[PDB]
């Protein structure tokens, strides 16, 4: 029931 | 009587219902061929497919048993391609033939190729409330009679503008699955406010429509600006109209005197009619560039407004008391007060490690570096629109100036679809 | 005075006579001086004899025979080699200088004719609000064989443009380049009359940070230099490019009317450009005036950008940015040209202008000038040395051109020019 | 009687 998408453009 | 399992199929092209005998093992390709053998054996059915309205699904996988898909079912034998009425950003109406079974992202891309509009991933379709054909887009007319703008000048609160954003179609579904009947007017708009390689050398029409979306947003107060700024946009638009007039000078109605413009060697070698015609041809491109450059400045001044490029959605934030707004932009999320429009808190995408959507409770939860999670609840409609907006802007930020002339639509779908 | 005999020419008191011409009076004045009187002593002795209420603070002493000013007040007459046979001049240091701007309009400026013309040019450009004066310099008009500064008008009549067209060969154009003033010396030392017009022109074709936001006048004059060089065929181009340059000029001039008529000469404002709340809050005559006021900067910006496109097309021409000088190459059999650009030296044919051989400045290790025989020698890392000979005037000018383009390449967007490095790279004396 | 100067920008 959950979707997860891990930011490609994650700098921090 | 064998195993009569009567199947009623409505053929939208002929407004005629037909009933067939099946066994449940007959294939999708099998029933379609039974349609043509019973109706016009001369008709071109190569564009027809079966659409199951109750399940809101096309039946494109031909080698599928009826049981594999799932008697007493109401199917439609309908053309995949239909006419779509669109309102352009310049507010002119147009009509286009689109495959109503392609995902809207692919449909939008194909509509922008027809219109010579690069980078369609920045555009999408939006629903209205409650016309030439193409395989005008260069018009850019001014707000003519005050009544036209007065009829459109009906203002809207910030909560009401946020309700309009429920109409952004799912880019990963087709036109048919989203309640678009034939000849209904959708809005083609620049959905994302991050314009890649806005190049005046080749994006004349793309720039024209983007300028027209900005123009109408400003004079209809979709986006606010100070009194001084509005005066500058008006003078900028007044200038664009004037520059537009200069591009339309012909052989008649020209003051071009080559004797004051070119070297005497040219005056002596050719007749004026050959010179001036050569000037006027070169002047058309020269005046067109001044027109595009002016629209570009109108777009950049629009871009610099403090409200620019924000799309608002009603949201109930975790630990909040009332309905507020979640603002989505090209680089950040904004928690905003639904009454004053004041930003309350901003989160940067660069600090967003990941986000997730719980489709049961309708909760978007964004995880950050060195910051507690952000959680908010939306309506079921807005939850999917918000998820696509976030994934959409993320997808655009990966666009590289490495001449990456190839949109990975698979990565977009992976970034923007949780299959609801 | 007390020698074996009286010093020759000395009066009974041992003083000797000294003739000084005061240019503001056309009158010579004699002073009885001694060999130990200082330069400041001669000036003060002058000011006593002349009008005592007039201001003599701008006057200095000029020696035409020695082609030098006498601005060292602590120098004695014997230390300057000034005997009784010396004809000096008491003259104003700041004088009036006629200048034809690149737009072909004549202005007159006041400059110290004792400052090195580099510093002069720098001060002239600051008066004109033209940034980067190192890119410009002064050029003597060749002998035939802010208002004005923003004016950009077309040719009045084909007959006017015809009287200016001189169909000169390439050799004649290179001879015109003999009159670039020495940047290391002053106006006086270079035979410039106060009532004679010099050409203020962009000398080097490397324009640092030509910015449409604050270089309007610098852009207009550069554009006007580009327009007139193309009309008068200083530089050549195809027939297609001439029509495009003509269309651009026709376009630029139509924009110029807007930037001059927006005030008053405007009835085209239709007021259908603002939200209805603005029509409801402000009278229609009030919003017209505020749109018109903001339109001046808008219309002006379109005008600069159009001129910017005219410049950019001009810079894209294949012969753009080359300054030609007569030169004899070490193996040649006839007169040829040395072409100087911002990044290269070009050996060129003196009749057609066809490039024969190009040498990159990047590979140039060093260069030198043999002033005695007027030979310029360039050493390279990827090929053998280049060597050529010019006239006496050309030898100095070619040296300043080469050093100038190396100096301009040192400029970075971060910055007070460093005129010391310019003078080092562009001086031989 | 000569004037030899070196360009700082050899690269």
Numbering used by the authors:
A (entry chain C): 786 to 797
B (entry chain A): 14 to 83, 86 to 145, 199 to 203, 220 to 336, 513 to 680
C (entry chain B): 3 to 147, 218 to 336, 513 to 662, 665 to 679
D (entry chain D): 786 to 796
Per the authors:
Integrins are heterodimeric transmembrane receptors composed of alpha (α) and beta (β) subunits that link extracellular ligands to the actin cytoskeleton through intracellular adaptors. Cytoplasmic adapter proteins including KINDLIN2, Integrin-β1 binding protein 1 (ICAP1) and to a lesser extend FilaminA were shown to bind the Integrin-β1 peptide in the proximity of the K794-containing distal NPXY-motif. Integrin capture by the PH-domain-dependent membrane-associated KINDLIN2 is a key event in the induction of cell adhesion, even prior to TALIN1-association. Structural analysis of Integrin-β1 interaction with KINDLIN2, biochemical pulldown assay, and binding energy determination by using molecular dynamics simulation showed that acetylation of K794 and the K794Q-mutant increased KINDLIN2 binding affinity to the Integrin-β1.
We mutated the Lys794 to glutamine (Gln), an amino acid that was previously used to mimic acetylated Lys-residues of proteins as it provides charge neutralization and shares hydrogen-bonding capacities with the acetyl group. We also determined the crystal structures of Kindlin2 fused to the β1-K794Q peptide at 2.49 Å resolution. The surface representation of Kindlin2 indicated that the β1-K794Q peptide is bound closer to the Kindlin2 F3 subdomain than the wildtype β1 peptide, and that the β1-AcK794 peptide fits the Integrin binding groove of Kindlin2 more snugly than the wildtype peptide. (F) B-factor index for the respective B-factors of the wildtype and K794Q-mutant Integrin sequences demonstrating stabilization of the c-terminal KYEG-peptide sequence by the introduction of the acetyl-mimetic mutation (QYEG). Since B factors represent the atomic displacement and mobility of the side chain, this result further supports the notion that the K794Q mutation in β1 peptide enhances its binding with KINDLIN2. The peptide carrying the acetylation mimetic K794Q mutation also showed enhanced binding of KINDLIN2 compared to the non-modified peptide. but still had less negative dG than the peptide carrying the longer and positively charged arginine residue (K794R). Nonetheless, the biochemical affinity data validated the use of the K794Q mutation as a relevant model to recapitulate the effect of Integrin-β1 acetylation in cells. In the specific experimental case of permanent acetylation mimetism by the constitutive expression of the K794Q-mutant of Integrin-β1, KINDLIN2 is recruited with higher affinity leading to the formation of dysregulated immature adhesion.
